[PDB]
């Protein structure tokens, strides 16, 4: 069989995206409670990036695509990326 | 009288089916708890096959067909077979 390959799903910092939006994303797509979501968002703002979750490759691809889709639908340049864990 | 004809329902190892999926199958179709499902999966992986259950011929046919069905719609090669017990 094939063991799981785990990928980091990361959010990358950009000056033009509302902080509210980022939180909105975290609760919506990562089922984070508000308190944790805020923490991650602050991480994105100052560290310039923050790992939101670790998922199997297929789940991770889906998340990234859905987030970027959601961002562009709302006219924000916010970017979500994968990285081999 | 007629003794029931018992058939082994077996899972066969291939290098492309996620281990996650196999466990999903075991709980779903064989009402296994997660811990057991894992053991069987490891057996399939290392031994190249594992007996998931022993059922009457009619029940066994049904299982096999439903498993392979489920596998194909999830686009996995995993093969479920029968063998006279």
Curated annotation (Swiss-Prot), chains A, B:
Q: Which domain of life is it from?
A: Bacteria
Q: Per the UniProt entry, what are the Gene Ontology biological process annotations, in alphabetical order?
A: protein catabolic process; proteolysis; response to heat
Name one molecular function that GO assigns to this entry: molecular function inhibitor activity
Q: Family membership, please give it.
A: Belongs to the ClpS family.
State how it assembles.
Answer: Binds to the N-terminal domain of the chaperone ClpA.
Record function comment: Involved in the modulation of the specificity of the ClpAP-mediated ATP-dependent protein degradation.
- What is the name of this protein? ATP-dependent Clp protease adapter protein ClpS
* Species in which this protein is naturally found: Escherichia coli (strain K12)
What would be the name of the gene that encodes this protein? Answer: clpS
Quote the range of the complete protein represented: 22 to 106 of 106
